[PDB]
Every structure is written in C-alpha cells, then in structure tokens.
C-alpha cells in the first residue's frame, strides 16, 4: 500500500533473526513513500532505532566531503540500486537490504585500553543497534571504494555490494571486514 | 574613569556607584533589582462571627 519509490511493497519483508527486529524499520508502521524525512532522529538516544533503514542507508551513503548535503543525489542512487538488484535477483530490494544488514552486522568485536594482546585486551559482544550501524557503515564504505576509481557507477557498486552481503560470499567488503572483526575477537577471547 | 597627571606619571581612577532604587527615578533607576522580591503585607480579614445580612 505504501510502495516505497512507487513499488516494492514492504509488508512481505521478514527479518530472519529476532535480534534486530526491534531496530530494522521496514514494517508498515515505518513504511514511507520516499526515503527523505527531516524527522529529528538524532535529537534523543535510541531515536534512530525507529528511523527507517532505507533512510539510514541514504544518510550513511552521503560521505567524504564532496557529498555532505547531496541527499537528493543519494536518494536517486538508492533508487537506481534497488532497480538494479531487483533486476539481478528478482526478489524484494528491501528484503535484500535487510538480509545484507543481518549478514553484515558483526556479532562481536574487541575493545580495551591496556597492553594489547592482539588488538584489544577483551572480546566484547555488541548491541543490536551497533550491529545495524556497523552493517550500514560497512555496506556504504564497500560501495564507495568499489565505485571510486572504476567505470562501474556507484549505483551498480552499491547494488552488488548488497547482493553479495545478502548471501555471504566473501566478495563484499562488508562481510570481509565482519569476518576480520570476528576473528580478532575470537583471538582476543 | 579619569586620569591624574602626576609628576611621576599617570594615575588611573575608577569610581563605581550603585544607585539606590527609587520609584521617583530622579536619584536612581525606577525599576527594582531583577531578583528583588517584595511582598505586600496582608490584613487581618478574620471574620470570626456569625453570618449577617447588612442592608445598604
């Protein structure tokens, strides 16, 4: 009924794990016609949790100096990426994005200050909000260095980054960095 | 602020005076201090007797 970008109904998208179903916001109460809303989502703690994850991807996809206000450009990038992944896979672009977030969120990391064993003294599991934040950041970063100095445009780079992340193939920077973080934490156990 | 030209040099004089409050305003500010709170004294208004009805 809402049809983000005019298509891709939200109600069929299902989150496969209950760890992030309170922080992914694709359900009909958070379904919006367009990923652009000046919603003051940074005003209070945990307000970004109810922000739609397509809005989060749009906000985190606009980085590196040249692009700090070009939200309309980022919206068109996301729209083209959803078109490309729909043509390439056949399933819901929102479902692909949700699966990419789930498979990109690193279940644990390591953090401390003192004499480092390998990276940090302690291995610490992460919160679901940190999972979502890290996953979105990793996906956008991987798309950015995919699109930096090659003819393949940012839309296709984001598209195949999400495609690789939604399955798990070690071909996406997001899950490569996730595996690196997991190995570091396991060594720092 | 004034300067005094003494044989040894210049002497600086700074004078600050807090004007007293007055509603008249010809010796000081008309407004009171912002944090100054004044309360009017209540009267008795006891009325301890039986109810009455006075025709006027």
């Amino acid at each position: 009924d809402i049809k983000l970008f005019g298509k891709w109904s939200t109600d069929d998208v299902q989150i496969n794990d209950i760890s992030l179903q309170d922080y992914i916001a694709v359900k009909e109460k958070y379904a919006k016609y367009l990923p652009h809303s000046a919603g003051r989502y940074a005003a209070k703690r945990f307000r970004k949790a109810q922000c739609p994850i397509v809005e989060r991807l749009t906000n985190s996809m606009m980085m590196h100096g040249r692009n700090n206000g070009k939200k309309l450009m980022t919206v068109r990038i996301v729209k083209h990426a959803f078109e490309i992944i729909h043509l390439l896979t056949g399933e819901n672009p929102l479902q692909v994005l949700v699966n990419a977030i789930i498979n990109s969120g690193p279940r644990e990391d390591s953090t401390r200050i003192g004499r480092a064993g390998t990276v940090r003294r302690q291995a610490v599991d992460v919160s679901p909000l940190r999972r979502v934040n890290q996953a979105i950041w990793l996906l956008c970063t991987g798309a950015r260095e995919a699109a930096f100095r090659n003819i393949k445009t940012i839309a296709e780079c984001l598209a195949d980054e999400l495609i690789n992340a939604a399955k798990g193939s070690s071909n996406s920077y997001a899950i490569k960095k996730k595996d690196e973080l997991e190995r570091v934490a396991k060594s720092n156990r | 602020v004034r300067h005094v030209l003494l044989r040894q040099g210049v002497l600086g004089i700074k004078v600050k005076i807090m004007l007293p409050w007055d509603p008249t305003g010809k010796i000081g500010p008309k407004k009171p201090l912002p944090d100054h709170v004044s309360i009017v004294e209540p009267k008795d208004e006891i009325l301890p007797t039986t109810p009455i009805s006075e025709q006027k």
Partner: protein, 135 residues
C-alpha cells in the same frame, strides 16, 4: 537535570505561602494569578517559577507539616499538645511493682509499708552487660 530552584524563589515562595495560605491553591495558574498582586515580581519567568514552587510546597503542606509556618497547622499542634490530658492519669497505678532494694530505701526514708506497692521477686543471675568485643 538543572531544574534546582534557588533561594530567590524558595524564600519568596515560603513567605507568600505563610502570608496568603488562604488565597493560594493547588492550581499553578491560579497561584501565578494571585502572585502579581500579592507580590511585586520584576520578571514573568521569576513569577511563574515562584508559582510552581508554591504549588509544590502546598502539595507538601496538605500532605504534611512542612517547616513553613501555617496558622491552621499551629492551632492543630497547639490543641494536640496543651490538651488530651487523659481522664485518668498515667501515674495513678493501683499497684507499683517495687524492687526489694527500693523497698529498703523507702523504709529508710520512712515511706515504707505502703498499701500500693507490690514487692517483685528479684532477678537471679546478674547477667547484664553486653559481651565484650566482637563475636
């Protein structure tokens, strides 16, 4: 955070409460409407802050005797202190349980052999004093 009131508002609130306890009420707007004529407040913000503290203090007063002076509370306390002498005293006991040593003291005083004294059996064991140190 950072909503602590200062002396400027607290003292003024207590003073106007103890002066106009009858006129004041538990309504913030009613209190801030009596403030303009019961007191001269240089600032609207100061006036409404004082009114809010007056509402808080009157809720506390109606739930209990706050240190702010109040004539109704004082007359109730007066009635509760300078009255309620019981019709029978607490010191007119029919029998007084008396220690034999105190009985000897009374006998030396010459007030021994009174009909209102019943001699208790003295305790045996001398087990007063708390055990010394811990454990």
């Amino acid at each position: 955070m950072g909503r602590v009131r200062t002396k400027t508002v607290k003292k003024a609130a207590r003073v106007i409460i103890e002066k106009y306890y009858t006129r004041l009420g538990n309504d913030f707007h009613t209190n801030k409407r009596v403030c303009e004529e019961i007191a001269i407040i240089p600032s609207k913000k100061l006036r409404n802050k004082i009114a809010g503290y007056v509402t808080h203090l009157m809720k506390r007063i109606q739930r209990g005797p706050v240190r702010g002076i109040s004539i109704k509370l004082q007359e109730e306390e007066r009635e509760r202190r300078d009255n309620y002498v019981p019709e029978v005293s607490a010191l007119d006991q029919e029998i007084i349980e008396v220690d034999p040593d105190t009985k000897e003291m009374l006998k030396l005083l010459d007030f021994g052999s009174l009909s209102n004294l019943q001699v208790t059996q003295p305790t045996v064991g001398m087990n007063f004093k708390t055990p010394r140190g811990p454990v």
